[PDB]
């Protein structure tokens, strides 16, 4: 019995994901692993339970297949052939935020990531670029995290207040039906080969900061509780956004963090809210222009206004990242 | 061209002839004040017509106090009518059907309403008479 | 055979074929019930919508009274008569086995509550309105099953299930004696999607010390996935009694089998104004037209809000703009802009702070009153259900009061962990929950109305706003306004304040004479929220110019401000200007509204200290400066003292001075122009 | 007896129609079953005096409501329907016995074991269970107050909330319990329950009350006519403590207190008097808090460190019968109408001092924990006694520096007395002679009977004036209050309401 949940990139914002039960028979077992994207092509059946009528949908699989067309593959080579392909991607990252060109280069590099390779079967060098968003709040810091959840293929948004010790890593919980010690995944477990989004990194407990540092080096979370010794994997780009910003004080005193925590992050973005009359006029005009525009002729006019404000569309940028990652 | 209260004319910034216009403002105490009292009658005459089709389309006979009936009208029309406006609805309906709604005052400031048979055909014919009397 | 049941079914068939509402735009006799059946054939629907007001207008309401009194007894009769009308018109809607059609009644008169649920109303059509807290999944239900025996091999079709797996006791074949062996046929059984929704009381109904009651509402038909947690919906159904299957003295449980869900928070951007204008009475539109035509509507709505508190007109101005809010615009990438305005009440204790918070809760819909003295009670909590066993999500204070104003008291006495979840919902208006394997995002588009206290009792003017309050830096930057109420010991302020308390305690409700009643204010607030003002080209240059002048006062180093001007101060002026234009029913942001919001924002930023009404002196001074300055631009002659009083004689036509009060305003104009002569504002040549 | 009263009231109703000769429907009145609700009897036996011989006897109970349970449906008329000919029947339940029909009543059917019981078409009755707690005024010292189960029927449900003083005067019935849920055996013990008949609070409304005696009202007006009322009541409230005339004059007004002018469109104003005692300890400070609790029927006595922010509000307890999350009242909720005595007010935590800010202003306790955001009402006066840090009020130190109380907490009080322990030879000599006279004779023979009022007469003078006497501020009295408020500031709004 495998419990399949909806993908994080298809769930609409403001709703809760659903999950059903999948039954694997014959040689279909030991195929789907906890942390992969498969295509269950089974029959939608139903079962009657005695407890389902007094307290107040099983899919029998038949074939499992783990996870663009030919016209979209030829268009990627034509766009990337230009000399300004790098500048076009940076300008397309987060089109709802004006300015802040230094922060868009770190988010775009963290989405693609590096090439991990083992060293003669001994060490495993990571490739996920860790970006730590630091600076004064008000510069659309939290708006960048919401953009990755709607563009990346696997992004799990989390926080620092609600997510405790088991909110990020795995846990050993008891099943209320089978009365057995099951294993429930967390934020770092359900985001394998994806992007990790954590909000408010400074307002975190001491028990949760040590579990993150242990997964940023070996890319594995070893949890041995209730006699269940399991060593799960966790390979993702942790993109946090904490809050202190005194310019006279260094980063070790402004941010409430330690030394090994700041050393694991690759790029350290620092935002300084300065006073400039030229930057305030350009920022105020983009806000009003983005709020005015907020049956076939009416739909075509709305799509043309959105493509003019981004200038590369958003639908083409999503498939361009996953094409150069596998 | 329907009712649309949205125009740019509002807040447009920039002898003894106008003094005579201020003398005519004293006549508003019997004209503008009388029109304000008639405006509340328009929001009570047509408002009590649908109220009789709401309470009588439910329970009947059992006694109902003024405090219990006022909280049921506001809760059923909040999607409004205040607590003070709900008391005038039951008071105006007594003059239309005095033989169907019985009002018995209690020594202490309490009114209990009671109805036996509420006919919709009899109230529909009496609603057009009360609406035409206020228009004259 | 039921004699009374057959009479209701015969009258229900004629109601769906003879009733017709005349259209007011075309004037043609169009049948709404006949056209609804034809619309269900294209979209392949199995749920009809019948209004209760149309049933009472036929046969003097004789048919609507028999259904509203005994709904469970006439339930199979109403479904049988509906299938006969569909078969006569479009018979293709029966073949899928016959489809199960359900009737969903909407627009009901009386709307009962949860505390009014009694045993005498079991089996009658009611209407319960509450807030949705917990919801189950989409699971099928065994309605009309088919049992096939193993001996006689007879297919017993049309087997109803009364909330229990009932089996037939006898086989239709007389040559068989089987009373136990029965096999369920899934290919010949009718399944229906049922869902149990646990509702609770409304967020606006906050009585005294009571216990929150819950009701298990069962939805059937097309009502699945229609009651989202956190939104107050209007349910409609019958009160059923579900027994205990695990105990099979028989314990029973009170349930509510609903058939239609009406969302109150939900109800083309131009169609939002025609619905609210048509749902009210004819006299309600006439009362709203005279208010917009009034040139002094911004001054009357301020005095009408909180009449028990005297003075403090600056703090009362932000309450009107907070109830309306801004325009929630969406970007082209999917980001949602915050349109709400958060105001914090900072000042000395015992300054009518509890009166302002209790007035917003007991007036604005969907408002939860809480205090600072937990972390789960504000946002949400993950509590496992004791019946089902799975982990559920429990709504808190920021979820039940959606699209409203959340009043929080004692913000400085909050913990560090409890303040981290508050700042998270003050940016994207969303709450991220990641616990017990549940990774879902819940919206929180509320308005936080804090009321903290300064550290030390009295507000120290020698310190800043950050050092005087026990709050962090990112949380203090979320509020757009900071009304500082200073407890000044004045002889004129304490005299007028003590007179209002004595008059309020003696006359009770007789001393309160507001310009607008409570029912008239609720209709203007909900109507002004549908308006969306658009910034014009002339108003765009005034907002940028006003932002540069305010930022120059903080960079000069002379006036030590209590808070550094950041980027949020620029976006706060846009949200405040939209709320002012909404109160005047204007779809265009005039440049005059920016100057009004700029004065309120400057009064909230108090710098760190290192006979004639004051409201009338500023109005008479602002009008006398622009009039004289216009002479130099136009190129006239001069302006004597006689023409000064004559200038206000034509502009103040709505003063209502008559004859006695008119001469008093003329003498006051001579005293106003006399103070400007002694001061360094105006001058006289001869 | 009640069954006889239900029939005699029916024949008297028909006699009133014939004597009046009215044109009303006589069938609609005779079919209505009238019920009699007797209350306020003479047998006011408590829960501890429930003798076994009082089976099925109407005994009046004077307790307090603890919790509230939802309405439980009770079947009254069963509904049966055949499975072959579909013959609907209606069989009433007699003495809790559902006599199911063995055969069908139809002649064409007549099949044994063919009737189906439909619970969805039965006439259910309202039944509510209310847990009543014993009154602490009748519980002896050294014993814990027990509880009892109540059964409310008819239309009297949803009329008793948690923290309300009612008077249950119903029969004392009993139902047997089963030893097993699957067997038909019964235990030797019988579960006792009181069937509620009438609810008199201490639906419908009380028309009048007949408390105390009219002969005692003549003695009440006799003392009111005397000019020495402010001095006679000040000495009788504490005859064991010498001096402290200015302190006892404030506590006397706290028991009475101003009226509660409730407003419909205005906010609720707190009319209680919050008195805070300060100064050096060992000055008869703890003895005052022990005397007001014995006079007030709903007064409590708590300590500083002994009660945190959970014991004073409402601790989330659990029932030992249903194992459900219940809500029990605290020290500030059980005292709905009395004076709360708190010892060691300066030794409280920071989480407890923040909760009292809302009780001394709006008299409401809003708790939002575990997803339960409810507002509890707590309208009562707070009578505490503060203490300095080093247990010695230094004359060369300010009041805000000697006591660790928050400045906002000091402004919320009404009377901040400072009882100091000054060394005086003329004061210590007279104080020692007064305390020695109380130990020599058990009764004050030197003091006349017209100088010290008993405890029974003092409680009847406060409860009578707080239910009928309502002073109204006139124009002459309101003018002096404004002038006195301006002069005090020339030397907050909380001092004006005090």
Numbering used by the authors:
A (entry chain 2): 387 to 442, 449 to 459, 476 to 652, 657 to 706, 737 to 753, 758 to 772
B (entry chain 8): 459 to 472, 480 to 544, 548 to 604
C (entry chain 6): 104 to 199, 259 to 410, 447 to 465, 496 to 601, 604 to 840, 903 to 978
D (entry chain 4): 268 to 469, 492 to 780, 794 to 800
Publication excerpt:
In eukaryotes, the ring-shaped hetero-hexameric protein, MCM2-7, represents the core of the replicative helicase. The eukaryotic helicase MCM2-7, is loaded by ORC, Cdc6 and Cdt1 as a double-hexamer onto replication origins. The ORC/Cdc6 complex recruits Cdt1/MCM2-7 to form an ORC/Cdc6/Cdt1/MCM2-7 (OCCM) intermediate. Cryo-EM structures have revealed that double-stranded DNA (dsDNA) becomes inserted into the MCM2-7 ring during OCCM formation, which in turn induces partial ring closure.
In this study, we have utilised the advances in EM data processing technology that have occurred since the publication of our original OCCM structure. In the “closed-gate OCCM” complex, Mcm5 interacts directly with Mcm2, eliminating the 10–15 Å; wide gap between Mcm2 and Mcm5 that was previously observed. The structure reveals two important features: First, the C5 is now ordered and visible at the interface between ORC and MCM2-7, implicating the involvement of C5 in the loading process. Second, the ordered DNA density is longer, as it is better stabilised by the closed MCM2-7 ring and can therefore been seen interacting with Mcm2. In the closed-gate OCCM, we can observe a continuous 46 base pair (bp) dsDNA density entering the ORC-Cdc6 complex and emerging at the N-tier ring of MCM2-7. The Orc3-C5 interaction observed in the closed-gate OCCM is sterically hindered in the context of the open-gate OCCM complex, providing a structural explanation as to why C5 can only interact when the gate is fully closed. Since the full MCM2-7 ring closure is dependent on complete DNA insertion and C5 only binds to the closed ring, the structural data suggests that C5 probes for successful DNA insertion and ring closure. The closed-gate OCCM structure suggests that a central section of Orc6 bridges ORC and MCM2-7 through direct contact with the AAA+ domain of Mcm2.
